[PDB]
């Protein structure tokens, strides 16, 4: 009436919960790159010679 | 005399200072695929990675 060893298991199942990968879009930056410093339009000379 | 010994952090770098629960993490790692240190790795202990979480070895995510 006691507990005895039974037949060895024939296989093992290991369960884990996993989600999946999306598409590669690689959206690097809101406003991207190093935007260049640049000329103010027209500007004009702010200096003249004497005479 | 202090060269290379006294450094300074970059502008974006930062030190972590918050403390969190980190108690539901060992139970999530097992849902993800880790097998607890107790047993049944499902491979050979050589084709398995030893998982650690803050000094405490959760144990042996498959390779």
Swiss-Prot record, chain A:
Residues 29-41 have a biased composition (Pro residues). Signal peptide: none annotated. Residues 18-41 are annotated as: Disordered. It comes from the Eukaryota. The modification Phosphoserine is found at residues 26, 34. It is found in: Nucleus, Nucleolus; Chromosome. Component of the RNA polymerase I (Pol I) complex consisting of 13 subunits: a ten-subunit catalytic core composed of POLR1A/RPA1, POLR1B/RPA2, POLR1C/RPAC1, POLR1D/RPAC2, POLR1H/RPA12, POLR2E/RPABC1, POLR2F/RPABC2, POLR2H/RPABC3, POLR2K/RPABC4 and POLR2L/RPABC5; a mobile stalk subunit POLR1F/RPA43 protruding from the core and additional subunits homologous to general transcription factors POLR1E/RPA49 and POLR1G/RPA34. Forms a heterodimer with POLR1E/RPA49. Part of Pol I pre-initiation complex (PIC), in which Pol I core assembles with RRN3 and promoter-bound UTBF and SL1/TIF-IB complex. Component of RNA polymerase I (Pol I), a DNA-dependent RNA polymerase which synthesizes ribosomal RNA precursors using the four ribonucleoside triphosphates as substrates. Involved in UBTF-activated transcription, presumably at a step following PIC formation. Belongs to the eukaryotic RPA34 RNA polymerase subunit family. It is in an antisense orientation to and overlaps the gene of the DNA repair enzyme ERCC1. This gene overlap is conserved in mouse, suggesting an important biological function. This is DNA-directed RNA polymerase I subunit RPA34. It comes from Homo sapiens (Human). The chain holds residues 103 to 153 of 510 of the full protein.
From Swiss-Prot, chain B:
It is found in: Nucleus, Nucleolus; Chromosome. Belongs to the RNA polymerase beta chain family. It is linked to Treacher Collins syndrome 4: A form of Treacher Collins syndrome, a disorder of craniofacial development. Treacher Collins syndrome is characterized by a combination of bilateral downward slanting of the palpebral fissures, colobomas of the lower eyelids with a paucity of eyelashes medial to the defect, hypoplasia of the facial bones, cleft palate, malformation of the external ears, atresia of the external auditory canals, and bilateral conductive hearing loss. TCS4 inheritance pattern is autosomal dominant. Component of the RNA polymerase I (Pol I) complex consisting of 13 subunits: a ten-subunit catalytic core composed of POLR1A/RPA1, POLR1B/RPA2, POLR1C/RPAC1, POLR1D/RPAC2, POLR1H/RPA12, POLR2E/RPABC1, POLR2F/RPABC2, POLR2H/RPABC3, POLR2K/RPABC4 and POLR2L/RPABC5; a mobile stalk subunit POLR1F/RPA43 protruding from the core and additional subunits homologous to general transcription factors POLR1E/RPA49 and POLR1G/RPA34. Part of Pol I pre-initiation complex (PIC), in which Pol I core assembles with RRN3 and promoter-bound UTBF and SL1/TIF-IB complex. The active site comprises the fork loops, the loops and the rudder that stabilize the transcription bubble and assist polymerase translocation. Catalytic core component of RNA polymerase I (Pol I), a DNA-dependent RNA polymerase which synthesizes ribosomal RNA precursors using the four ribonucleoside triphosphates as substrates. Transcribes 47S pre-rRNAs from multicopy rRNA gene clusters, giving rise to 5.8S, 18S and 28S ribosomal RNAs. Pol I-mediated transcription cycle proceeds through transcription initiation, transcription elongation and transcription termination stages. This is DNA-directed RNA polymerase I subunit RPA2. It comes from Homo sapiens (Human).
């Amino acid at each position: 009436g006691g507990l005895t060893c039974a037949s060895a298991p024939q296989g093992t199942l290991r369960i884990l919960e996993g989600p999946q990968q999306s598409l590669s879009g690689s959206p690097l930056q809101p406003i991207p790159a190093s935007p260049p410093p640049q000329i103010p339009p027209g500007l004009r000379p702010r200096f003249c010679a004497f005479g | 005399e202090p060269c290379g010994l006294m450094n300074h952090l970059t502008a974006v770098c930062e030190v972590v200072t918050q403390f969190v629960y980190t108690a539901s993490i060992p139970a999530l790692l097992c849902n993800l695929g880790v097998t607890p240190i107790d047993g049944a790795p499902h491979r050979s202990y050589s084709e398995c990675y030893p998982v650690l979480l803050d000094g405490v070895m959760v144990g042996w995510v498959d390779k």
